[PDB]
Amino acid sequence: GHMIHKLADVQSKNIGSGTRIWQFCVVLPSAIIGENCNICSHCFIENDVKIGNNVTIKCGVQIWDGIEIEDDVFIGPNVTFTNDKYPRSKQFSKTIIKKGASIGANATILPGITIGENAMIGAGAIVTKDVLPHVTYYSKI
Amino acid sequence: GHMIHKLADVQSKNIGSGTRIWQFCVVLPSAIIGENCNICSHCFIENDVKIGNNVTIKCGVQIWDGIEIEDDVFIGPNVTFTNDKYPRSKQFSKTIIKKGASIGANATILPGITIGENAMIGAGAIVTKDVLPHVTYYSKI
Amino acid sequence: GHMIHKLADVQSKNIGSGTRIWQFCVVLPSAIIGENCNICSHCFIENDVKIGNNVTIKCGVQIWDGIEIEDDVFIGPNVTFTNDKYPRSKQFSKTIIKKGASIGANATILPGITIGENAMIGAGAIVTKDVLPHVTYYSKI
Ligand SMILES: CC(=O)SCCNC(=O)CCNC(=O)[C@H](O)C(C)(C)COP(=O)(O)OP(=O)(O)OC[C@H]1O[C@@H](n2cnc3c(N)ncnc32)[C@H](O)[C@@H]1OP(=O)(O)O
Ligand SMILES: CC(=O)SCCNC(=O)CCNC(=O)[C@H](O)C(C)(C)COP(=O)(O)OP(=O)(O)OC[C@H]1O[C@@H](n2cnc3c(N)ncnc32)[C@H](O)[C@@H]1OP(=O)(O)O
Ligand SMILES: CC(=O)SCCNC(=O)CCNC(=O)[C@H](O)C(C)(C)COP(=O)(O)OP(=O)(O)OC[C@H]1O[C@@H](n2cnc3c(N)ncnc32)[C@H](O)[C@@H]1OP(=O)(O)O
Ligand SMILES: Cc1cn([C@H]2C[C@H](O)[C@@H](COP(=O)(O)OP(=O)(O)O)O2)c(=O)[nH]c1=O
Ligand SMILES: Cc1cn([C@H]2C[C@H](O)[C@@H](COP(=O)(O)OP(=O)(O)O)O2)c(=O)[nH]c1=O
Ligand SMILES: Cc1cn([C@H]2C[C@H](O)[C@@H](COP(=O)(O)OP(=O)(O)O)O2)c(=O)[nH]c1=O
Fold this sequence. Notes:
3 copies of one chain form a homotrimer. The first copy, chain A, has a single domain, classed as Hexapeptide repeat proteins (UDP N-Acetylglucosamine Acyltransferase, domain 1, 3 Solenoid), CATH 2.160.10. Chain A contains no helices and 19 strands. Chain A has strands at 3-4, 9-10, 20-21, 26-27, 32-33, 38-39, 44-45, 49-51, 56-57, 62-63, 67-69, 74-75, 95-97, 102-103, 108-109, 114-115, 120-121, 126-127, 136-137. Chain A is an all-beta fold. In chain A, 0% of the residues lie in helices and 29% in strands. One thymidine-5'-diphosphate sits between chains B (22-23, 38, 40-41, 56, 59) and A (26, 28, 46, 90).
């Protein structure tokens, strides 16, 4: 089975064996989450979301409609994803994070992005363009 | 009426019709929130706070004392606001986000800032100076 | 005594007099927190964590295993800490924030960092190298 913390609001039944979902998470009904994932505290996971096996999602991550996380991905704490490039209140793009990629803490991913297999995104990076497989990308400070 | 999720702690009665406040939000007693707002999960809204009508506040946003959000504003997830330029533990400035402006995901807004009507702030930007009406501003990476 | 909000999950008994821990915090059993701290809403505090006296931790902060916060430190909202420089899912470094230092809102601190006494880190900064005592550091935009 899977472990849902009593202080989480998990509405999806589509959750693989060995997955842990921690305190103060929200997971909406259509979310798909694979086996042996760790969804740490304070995450939000929307409906049109697929998360593979052995994925680590650290605290404070929201994964929106139209985002796919492949197997073995690491998402650092407070990583931010997006699906609307020109948002206006009361007015979409797909992101895919490919197998084994790692996204550094508090990075910001623009809409429509592909991050290639085994890529490494630096902490605090802003990713405005696709990142090739196995590439280390970080923003200049 | 307005919708307050059972898993939110909303202490303000000053909430307009059609407003939704989602899981794991905190709203302190003096907050004013207009009609048809969406306050997404994991937000914090302090006392000396005015939020207009048709405002979208995505997940993970804290709005501190001395901050005003006008009508039709979009606040991206994990946008950070501030009200003390030189903070020291155990030792204020006003921000106003003007009508229809949009703040990109995980942007950081310094104290005392005005963001003009219909401005667009890039995801992950650091806003250290006012942004003129209708201007698109983003930080160099 | 100390104040633990009913909507927090605090598992540590090692909490000093006058400390407040607010809604939707998680504090794991071995955490040590001194006197007169303010742990604001939506924080996560792991096991191998020592926090001194008179520390302010604003909303949305996670403090991981191997991180020490000295007395009189200010941590801005959504400040991100790290303890693994090359994270890969299903595969550590110490940080110390020295007495009286202040970390600006939504800053990102890489692993193994020392921030010196009374330093000031700008909002949204990425700290990839130690910051000397009493130095103001911010990232170029
Ligand atoms: C769940 C949700 O999604 S809620 C909605 C949240 N949505 C967002 O936060 C998206 C906000 N939108 C953005 O940041 C957009 O990139 C905008 C509005 C700032 C700019 O878009 P455009 O004006 O089309 O600029 P464009 O994509 O042509 O990029 C122009 C240049 O600016 C750079 N750039 C664009 N956006 C950013 C940014 N946020 N930060 C840094 N650099 C940026 C690009 O890399 C590009 O560089 P180049 O000319 O060297 O190739
Ligand atoms: C709820 C809460 O508010 S909790 C409290 C949280 N408070 C904060 O996070 C605020 C932290 N304070 C800051 O970041 C401040 O801007 C400080 C302390 C880094 C610097 O302030 P000052 O030293 O007065 O610098 P000043 O405002 O003169 O700016 C100097 C230059 O640095 C730039 N700058 C200042 N702060 C930053 C920053 N955080 N990031 C990037 N650039 C910055 C300015 O744009 C300015 O550029 P210019 O010379 O090209 O015009
Ligand atoms: C709870 C948790 O910890 S979950 C795990 C979260 N972990 C993380 O987010 C850590 C992610 N790792 C990083 O960001 C790393 O710095 C990496 C992987 C991007 C790069 O590390 P390395 O390739 O060893 O680069 P290195 O440390 O040699 O730095 C090279 C240069 O890039 C700069 N740099 C490195 N990382 C970053 C970054 N994230 N942002 C901006 N600049 C950076 C350095 O300052 C250095 O500059 P210099 O040559 O001018 O001195
Ligand atoms: C015990 C516990 C863990 N967690 C999350 C955050 C911790 O850093 C993490 C520890 O899991 P960890 O042992 O790191 O397993 P993994 O191999 O998936 O990294 O789980 C919570 O969010 N809340 C809790 O109460
Ligand atoms: C259903 C639900 C939505 N929400 C928030 C986050 C979702 O992205 C958002 C969906 O509202 P949305 O349909 O986007 O309305 P709007 O016109 O205001 O954008 O509401 C929560 O925070 N928790 C929930 O349980
Ligand atoms: C009342 C209240 C405060 N807080 C936190 C966030 C507020 O900005 C902060 C106010 O404490 P504050 O009066 O600023 O005391 P300090 O001297 O420690 O700064 O406490 C919560 O997280 N939840 C609450 O319900």
